[PDB]
């Protein structure tokens with residue numbers, strides 16, 4: 001069965017669109033009028049209240065603050081959501097802090113609150129609707145599609161994909177924010193977001209858990225030129241409660257990444273396992289791409305598809321983190337305890353991070369990579385301190401004869417100390 005809607009063309013319920021193991025429920029996309037896809041425009045000149053624009057009346061686009069010399073970014077919400085939800089306009093607001101842009105929020109709440117299998121068909125219409133607006137901008141406003149970026153969350157990721165496919169992959173970029181898994185995982189390229197849908201496609205996975213039983217709203221497999229897996233793409237810090245928490249983290253990390261690019265470097269790595277075990281640090285020669293808003297600044301962004309990148313974030317409060325590798329050479333007496341290091345630089349000082357916990361043998365090197373909640377800057381000094389999990393009555397003293405700190409850029413800073421301190425005493429090392 002097919003339904004056809006004016007200039008959006010026709011839509012079928014035949015495979016791979018329905019009746020398959022991936023998309024079992026046979027259904028057709030609802031009427032464009034029941035879905036009522038709306039375009040809410042925000043510009044640097046009207047940041048607080050939107051301007052409504054429609055593709056079928058170019059006069060609306062011309063009487064608005066839409067600016068043909070600025071890039072255009074669309075934001076599409078997903079399942080059960082609304083284009084009028086604060087996260088959309090707020091993301092636009094962060095953008096306005098760092099650039100001049102036409103920020104368009106796509107409201108398709110008319111079709112997002114349907115049942116899943118229905119909302120999944122509805123995005124076919126929403127996607128065609130987005131593609132038509134881009135088509136009119138190209139055609140009537142001489143605005144090139146390469147100046148377009150579409151950000152989509154959940155079903156919105158695949159919506160961006162439909163729009164990109166209908167625009168023949170000419171869209172500048174598509175960012176998938178935890179693209180939905182059900183009805184899309186393992187479907188052909190025409191159904192789901194894939195590298196071919198835009199010139200550059202960057203994906204942030206934050207809830208890749210298996211829906212049944214682990215309710216992982218997003219998909220585990222790679223769908224872009226560069227797929228980022230913050231915190232392994234599974235259990236985001238701070239999401240022990242709240243059902244949509246891990247799912248909504250992708251929006252939060254992207255939102256914060258507009259103001260804090262440096263706080264989210266992604267490390268090329270085969271897996272999170274290897275990353276956690278110090279095998280994907282520091283950044284490669286060309287640097288690490290910045291997850292989020294500026295991932296497009298990466299030199300080799302599209303030279304290959306499904307490039308995986310790992311990194312960790314905090315649990316709230318801008319989520320930003322900076323990774324360092326510290327190597328400690330022990331001195332003093334052999335005890336059993338844990339050694340901690342603190343970093344001091346011109347920007348600030350990190351907290352103390354356990355490097356090793358066990359048998360501290362003299363002249364034995366112990367490395368550990370950690371994620372600092374502060375970028376220290378150019379390192380000035382480093383502080384050591386160890387604890388004995390058994391106070392040996394001999395008052396043993398341990399020291400660090402040498403401490404090497406390697407930054408994400410591969411730069412090593414050496415620190416030396418001729419002293420040894422007893423348990424729980426801060427030893428400050430100096431440059432050497």
Ligand SMILES: [Ca+2]
Pocket residue numbers: 161162165189190191192193194196197
């Ligand atoms: Ca596709």
